[PDB]
Design a binder for this molecule. Structure first.
Ligand SMILES: [Cl-]
Ligand code: NA
Length: 129
C-alpha cells in the first residue's frame, strides 16, 4: 500500500508514535517518506547481505527474520515479510523497539541525513489530526 502523507500521519498517531521517546509525529512521517516513499512494500538489499523492509525500512540484520541473513538476530520477533503489510502495526511496534535502543532515530539513515534538524513539523501541516 502506498500511503498519503496525512493518511500515514493519522495511522502513526493512532499507533502511539507521536512524541514517542520525544520524537514528534513529523519526524516519523519524514523518515517514512525518505526511507520508502510511504510504500509498505519497499525492500532494499544491503552490501552485507541484509535487507531493509517496509515503510520504515527495518533491517533484517537485527530486527526481523527473512531466512537469508546468516548470523542475524530477530529482536522484533517477527518475519520480515510482516513488515510489508498494508497494516503498519508490525512496523510501528518494531520501530518503537528500535528508537528505544539508545541511538534514537539516528538508527534511520534517511532521518539523520534528510529530516534531523529540519522543520519536520511541515510533514504533518494541513493534516486533520
Ligand atoms: Cl533520543
Ligand atoms: Na534477522
Amino acid at each position: 500500500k502506498v500511503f498519503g502523507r496525512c493518511e500515514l500521519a493519522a495511522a502513526m498517531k493512532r499507533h502511539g508514535l507521536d512524541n514517542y521517546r520525544g520524537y514528534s509525529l513529523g519526524n516519523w512521517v519524514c523518515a517514512a517518506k525518505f526511507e520508502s516513499n510511504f510504500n509498505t512494500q519497499a525492500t532494499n538489499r544491503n552490501t552485507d547481505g541484509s535487507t531493509d523492509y517496509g515503510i520504515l525500512q527495518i533491517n533484517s540484520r537485527w530486527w526481523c527474520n527473512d531466512g537469508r541473513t546468516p548470523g542475524s538476530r530477530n529482536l522484533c520477533n517477527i518475519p520480515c515479510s510482516a513488515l510489508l503489510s498494508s497494516d503498519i502495526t508490525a512496523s510501528v511496534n518494531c520501530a518503537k523497539k528500535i528508537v528505544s535502543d539508545g541511538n534514537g532515530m539516528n538508527a534511520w539513515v534517511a532521518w539523520r541525513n534528510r529530516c534531523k534538524g529540519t522543520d519536520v513539523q511541515a510533514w504533518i501541516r494541513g493534516c486533520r489530526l
